[PDB]
Design a protein around this ligand. Structure first.
Ligand SMILES: *[C@@H]1O[C@H](CO)[C@@H](O[C@@H]2O[C@H](CO)[C@@H](O[C@@H]3O[C@H](CO)[C@@H](O)[C@H](O[C@H]4O[C@H](CO)[C@@H](O)[C@H](O)[C@@H]4O)[C@@H]3O)[C@H](O)[C@H]2NC(C)=O)[C@H](O)[C@H]1NC(C)=O
Ligand SMILES: *[C@@H]1O[C@H](CO)[C@@H](O[C@@H]2O[C@H](CO)[C@@H](O)[C@H](O)[C@H]2NC(C)=O)[C@H](O)[C@H]1NC(C)=O
Ligand SMILES: *[C@@H]1O[C@H](CO)[C@@H](O[C@@H]2O[C@H](CO)[C@@H](O)[C@H](O)[C@H]2NC(C)=O)[C@H](O)[C@H]1NC(C)=O
Ligand SMILES: *[C@@H]1O[C@H](CO)[C@@H](O[C@@H]2O[C@H](CO)[C@@H](O)[C@H](O)[C@H]2NC(C)=O)[C@H](O)[C@H]1NC(C)=O
Ligand SMILES: *[C@@H]1O[C@H](CO)[C@@H](O[C@@H]2O[C@H](CO)[C@@H](O)[C@H](O)[C@H]2NC(C)=O)[C@H](O)[C@H]1NC(C)=O
Ligand SMILES: *[C@@H]1O[C@H](CO)[C@@H](O[C@@H]2O[C@H](CO)[C@@H](O)[C@H](O)[C@H]2NC(C)=O)[C@H](O)[C@H]1NC(C)=O
Ligand SMILES: *[C@@H]1O[C@H](CO)[C@@H](O[C@@H]2O[C@H](CO)[C@@H](O)[C@H](O)[C@H]2NC(C)=O)[C@H](O)[C@H]1NC(C)=O
Ligand SMILES: *[C@@H]1O[C@H](CO)[C@@H](O[C@@H]2O[C@H](CO)[C@@H](O)[C@H](O)[C@H]2NC(C)=O)[C@H](O)[C@H]1NC(C)=O
Ligand SMILES: *[C@@H]1O[C@H](CO)[C@@H](O)[C@H](O)[C@H]1NC(C)=O
Ligand SMILES: *[C@@H]1O[C@H](CO)[C@@H](O)[C@H](O)[C@H]1NC(C)=O
Ligand SMILES: *[C@@H]1O[C@H](CO)[C@@H](O)[C@H](O)[C@H]1NC(C)=O
Ligand SMILES: *[C@@H]1O[C@H](CO)[C@@H](O)[C@H](O)[C@H]1NC(C)=O
Ligand SMILES: *[C@@H]1O[C@H](CO)[C@@H](O)[C@H](O)[C@H]1NC(C)=O
Ligand SMILES: *[C@@H]1O[C@H](CO)[C@@H](O)[C@H](O)[C@H]1NC(C)=O
Ligand SMILES: *[C@@H]1O[C@H](CO)[C@@H](O)[C@H](O)[C@H]1NC(C)=O
Ligand SMILES: *[C@@H]1O[C@H](CO)[C@@H](O)[C@H](O)[C@H]1NC(C)=O
Ligand SMILES: *[C@@H]1O[C@H](CO)[C@@H](O)[C@H](O)[C@H]1NC(C)=O
Ligand SMILES: *[C@@H]1O[C@H](CO)[C@@H](O)[C@H](O)[C@H]1NC(C)=O
Ligand SMILES: *[C@@H]1O[C@H](CO)[C@@H](O)[C@H](O)[C@H]1NC(C)=O
Ligand SMILES: *[C@@H]1O[C@H](CO)[C@@H](O)[C@H](O)[C@H]1NC(C)=O
Lengths: 442, 112, 112, 112, 52, 42
């Protein structure tokens, strides 16, 4: 004598996709955190006892949503800023002298041109300084901006800062965010220690290549993650146990000048560099890097054998963004050469100096048709950061190869934010059940 | 708190239904529209569940007994190994095949 | 299915109220806003109907009996020619004049 | 009409609850989004109140008796000077301290 | 294609290789006659039986 | 006709073919697009 009894509010969930919203701690920023909900001081995390879940790092939709949101915010931030259409003219450029060094020879050019005024009746002869990577010669000499045959340039608004700030992703009503608490989780498979939350930890959208900066550290050991470790077409994500400090600087004392190109529209050009001219560069610690590489190769020798020679070489081909460590240091975009970091072989006080280059016409998100111009920054620039990860790729050495070669990679930013959203998943609650009892309706 | 008894037996999770019940309703223009749609969808799901409960005769209840007898072909386990040695996540995976038949029986039993 | 008994008598259409009940809740930016408003309006109409039913004392019911006697001045036809020789579309046209009086009587009878 | 008995005693205002009950549900793109959010928020508030009432065991009611006895430490005034010499605005200002305790007691009493 | 600015192109007509002729449509004569007969037969139900 | 270039400094002499219904003569011969006194073309 058993009867069907209905229960509403049972702990059952399913896998689902939804739109998560943004929250930030409680003004001109690229990612408009002022429009996001303020965050609670003490978030609730509920450990689910005796619960085992299945996670997949490489088929997560939070990564896609985060990529789309970042791209959309970047596009939105450039709407009210000045268009630089009259800047696509012919420039007359000369080489820069007066206290340049040997390594800085030919990197700066002094270009004069004619520019429109606030009156639609006359011109003005002005001049500026351009980096060699921003101008292409058309046959002193005649140059043009690198972009004036493919796209249009918008000048970045100088009051908006590029500094990343932490953001949190929250689930709507009827959804939960499951979080894996295993300390040696390798991205895919069963996690037996699970908690539930509604918000993720503060994630800073740092854009960089070949090196992960200002991120999270593994709790126990260096972690190696890959979708298919035997497939050499997949990238390898390496997570450090301790960070590696890196100091980058542009030492030139720059000057900024404002040129009126129309009614209520100004253009910020580079003036003169007071003093000498030197090359921007980064410093890393040699001993710390050696120890980190030793730990990385120690962890790598668990998938490829115990007696295999493991050697690190540098990048192989590509454009400037993918063959260099590209990042942003206080409004200036750096492209640094990492041939001194990934160059060694391993058999079973000092510093490393990486020279860098500066560019001012920026194409982001591997797109074409839209370009941004970064106005110059005044004074000497210095930044300090943590290296907390690596992106690597393996060469497909066939014909009985006893050695493996790993090269730095990158280019796709989904793997930058896949190294932070790797322990979260989104579930949808289904609070309706039926079961046999001995109670009958009266 | 929320989803606390997901690893506990079916019996232990029957005393905390209100925790999950109350965490289903409140717990540029492009982003403004996206957030609004989620809030409308949660309300729609809640209203559909409430309408189904009302149609079954169980409006305003968390636990509700019915006049529909339990067919032994849906499950053969006895009450000792269901309410004391089983979780809801396992029970759903087992009775997922017979859910629609039971729902139709509930509807037609309440109507008649 | 839906609106199937629109041509049948009032008695025959009284056994399929669930079909109409279910099909009232789920059955660029310019177009996105337009579709959202319809979904909000359907929810609002459903909630107003549910509130009225609850105020009358008939919450969670499809057929509900009341304590308000039927005045013969609203209609003089007997039960044989109402439930067996008439449809709801014809009945609404006949009693459209007295609807508000009946609603007020229901409200004040349930409250007192 | 609406809020008419705000200056009358608690006893007189208990006979016009439906007036306030009804006036809680229906009574460029920039402005279009703002107006929609107001309606969504009103619907959400109404649904939260209805869920709370249903959890307390008072689904579809305006006045509901409970099994929770009144603690004398919440208020010592007798019924003659509460329902006949007091308004709801004054009563709220006095019992605002003990509201959460009473709500928790109601929930745990109905569940058990 | 003619480039008229940074990232903007204009598609013009070049040269027509061969002879130049006029665009045209063909319809069937018998089918159109039958259709017009049916149309006038249906029209004669509103205006009379002896109207031209 | 003369058309602007990708550089805001110089022009280019180009040509095209137009149907008679799209050009109106303004007093070879001098013509203009039919729309360039009432509206803009996309
Ligand atoms: C990883 O994180 C570190 C630590 O947070 C971070 O280093 C920080 O970089 C920022 C940006 O360069 C530094 O903040 C600057 O510091 C000085 C002093 O205030 C000024 O140059 C800047 O302020 C001026 O510019 C602002 C922009 O609008 C104005 O609002 C302001 O009025 C000033 O004009 C700015 O505040 C910060 O000091 C460092 N922190 C440390 C400890 O060095 C690093 O950049 C991160 N790495 C990456 C790759 O993002
Ligand atoms: C860049 O070139 C400009 C001229 O195009 C230089 O500015 C002139 O410098 C000379 C020599 O010192 C002065 O006599 C002029 O008065 C300056 N101004 C102008 C408007 O001609 C400028 O010094 C050059 N800058 C660098 C870094 O080489
Ligand atoms: C991971 O990649 C390897 C290749 O690196 C895949 O193994 C291949 O499997 C195909 C058949 O599916 C064989 O023809 C190839 O010879 C295999 N290659 C090697 C090098 O052994 C493997 O299937 C991939 N794993 C998954 C899960 O997709
Ligand atoms: C990186 O380290 C180098 C080398 O120490 C610094 O460059 C200068 O190096 C010379 C010797 O080659 C020293 O005499 C100078 O003192 C160094 N400069 C300074 C400012 O101390 C370089 O400055 C370092 N860069 C960073 C960003 O730390
Ligand atoms: C990067 O710069 C930091 C300071 O911003 C350096 O840290 C200093 O190192 C010196 C030399 O050992 C110490 O005397 C100071 O006390 C340190 N300062 C702080 C605040 O810790 C750091 O050494 C630099 N790193 C590299 C690789 O050059
Ligand atoms: C990787 O390192 C190699 C070896 O240093 C680089 O090859 C050098 O390229 C430069 C020009 O860029 C030549 O002057 C050198 O002679 C080359 N060296 C050798 C040994 O052939 C290569 O460019 C580096 N790849 C990068 C930085 O992407
Ligand atoms: C990155 O750095 C490496 C090592 O410094 C560069 O390789 C040198 O390139 C220069 C010319 O730039 C050659 O004269 C040297 O002979 C190269 N060194 C070796 C050991 O081969 C490499 O070119 C740099 N990559 C760039 C500048 O793109
Ligand atoms: C319109 O074109 C269609 C074909 O696109 C013509 O149909 C063809 O007529 C010829 C001549 O009788 C037949 O041999 C072909 O088999 C027909 N083709 C098809 C696909 O049916 C049609 O006659 C043309 N109409 C007119 C009015 O010229
Ligand atoms: C600016 O205009 C002058 C005067 O027409 C011209 O001679 C010169 O080539 C132009 N460009 C410069 C100075 O770069
Ligand atoms: C623009 O000019 C550069 C430099 O001459 C050239 O390599 C590139 O192909 C051009 N872009 C297009 C889209 O033609
Ligand atoms: C970098 O590492 C240091 C040392 O662990 C830590 O205190 C700091 O918060 C890290 N992050 C940044 C952004 O500097
Ligand atoms: C990750 O761990 C699972 C078992 O938990 C294993 O099947 C899988 O191969 C591992 N992947 C890598 C890249 O080590
Ligand atoms: C840069 O130049 C400015 C202007 O002369 C000066 O005030 C400042 O001290 C300089 N900064 C240096 C030399 O680091
Ligand atoms: C890094 O460690 C390796 C392996 O012990 C050693 O051969 C090499 O000299 C070290 N490099 C340093 C200390 O700069
Ligand atoms: C590889 O060598 C290490 C050396 O510490 C050893 O611990 C490990 O078991 C070896 N793995 C094998 C032989 O698969
Ligand atoms: C790479 O390492 C070799 C061996 O130590 C060294 O000779 C060479 O200069 C290095 N290349 C660099 C640092 O670019
Ligand atoms: C179409 O019908 C008319 C009227 O009968 C006739 O005069 C004409 O010859 C017909 N045309 C044909 C058959 O091509
Ligand atoms: C018109 O003539 C047709 C010929 O078929 C006939 O059927 C119809 O009745 C006539 N209509 C009249 C005379 O109104
Ligand atoms: C183009 O410009 C030239 C040079 O100023 C002028 O003579 C000519 O009339 C213009 N128009 C043409 C070629 O249609
Ligand atoms: C534009 O020009 C045409 C052709 O000369 C003329 O007929 C028409 O009236 C003009 N339109 C206006 C609005 O003046």
């Amino acid at each position: 004598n058993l009867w069907v009894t209905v229960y509403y509010g049972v702990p059952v969930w399913k896998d689902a996709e939804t739109t998560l919203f943004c929250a930030s701690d409680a003004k001109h920023n690229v990612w408009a955190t002022h429009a996001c909900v303020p965050t609670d001081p003490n978030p609730q995390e509920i450990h689910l006892e005796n619960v085992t879940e299945e996670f997949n790092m490489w088929k997560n939709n939070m990564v896609e949503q985060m990529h789309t949101d970042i791209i959309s915010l970047w596009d939105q931030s450039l709407k009210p800023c000045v268009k630089l259409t009259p800047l696509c003219v012919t420039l007359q450029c000369t080489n820069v002298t007066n206290n340049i060094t040997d390594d800085m020879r030919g990197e700066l050019k002094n270009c004069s041109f004619n520019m429109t005024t606030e009156l639609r009746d006359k011109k003005q002869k002005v001049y500026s300084l351009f980096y060699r990577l921003d101008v292409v010669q058309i046959n002193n000499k005649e140059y043009r901006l690198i972009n004036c045959n493919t796209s249009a340039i918008t000048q970045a608004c100088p009051k908006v800062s590029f500094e990343p700030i932490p953001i949190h992703y929250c689930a709507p009503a009827g959804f939960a965010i499951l979080k894996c608490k295993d300390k040696k989780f390798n991205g895919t498979g069963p996690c037996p220690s699970v908690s539930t939350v509604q918000c993720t930890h503060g994630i800073k959208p740092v854009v960089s290549t070949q090196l992960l900066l200002n991120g999270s550290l593994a709790e126990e050991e260096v972690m190696i993650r890959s979708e298919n470790i035997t497939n050499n077409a997949k990238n390898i994500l390496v997570q450090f146990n301790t960070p590696v400090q890196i100091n980058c600087t542009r030492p030139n004392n720059n000057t900024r000048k404002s040129i009126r190109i129309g009614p209520g529209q100004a253009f910020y050009a580079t003036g003169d560099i007071i003093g000498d001219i030197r090359q921007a560069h980064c410093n890393v610690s040699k001993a710390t890097w050696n120890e980190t590489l030793g730990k990385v190769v120690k962890q790598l020798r668990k998938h490829f054998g115990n007696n295999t020679i493991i050697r690190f070489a540098n990048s192989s081909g590509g454009d400037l963004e993918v063959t260099t460590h590209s990042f942003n240091c206080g409004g200036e975009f750096f492209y640094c050469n990492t041939s001194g970091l990934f160059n060694s072989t391993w058999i079973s006080n000092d510093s490393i100096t990486l020279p860098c280059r500066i560019k001012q016409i920026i194409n982001m998100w591997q797109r074409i048709g839209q370009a941004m111009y970064a106005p110059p920054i005044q004074g000497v620039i210095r930044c300090v950061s943590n290296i907390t990860g690596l992106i690597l790729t393996r060469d497909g050495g066939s014909t009985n190869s006893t050695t493996e070669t790993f090269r730095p990679g990158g280019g796709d930013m989904r793997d930058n934010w896949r190294s932070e959203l790797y322990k979260y998943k989104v579930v949808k609650i289904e609070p309706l059940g039926v079961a046999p009892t001995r109670c009958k309706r009266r | 708190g929320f989803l606390g008894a997901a690893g506990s037996t079916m019996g232990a999770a029957s005393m905390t239904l209100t925790v999950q019940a109350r965490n289903l309703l409140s717990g540029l223009t492009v982003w403004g529209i996206k957030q609004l749609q989620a809030r409308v969808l949660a309300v729609e799901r809640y209203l559909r569940d409430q309408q189904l409960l009302g149609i079954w005769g169980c409006s305003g209840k968390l636990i509700c007994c019915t006049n529909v007898p339990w067919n032994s072909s849906w499950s053969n386990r006895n009450l000792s190994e269901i309410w004391d040695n089983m979780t809801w996540l396992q029970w759903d995976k087992e009775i997922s095949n017979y859910t629609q038949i039971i729902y139709g029986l509930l509807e037609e039993s309440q109507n008649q």
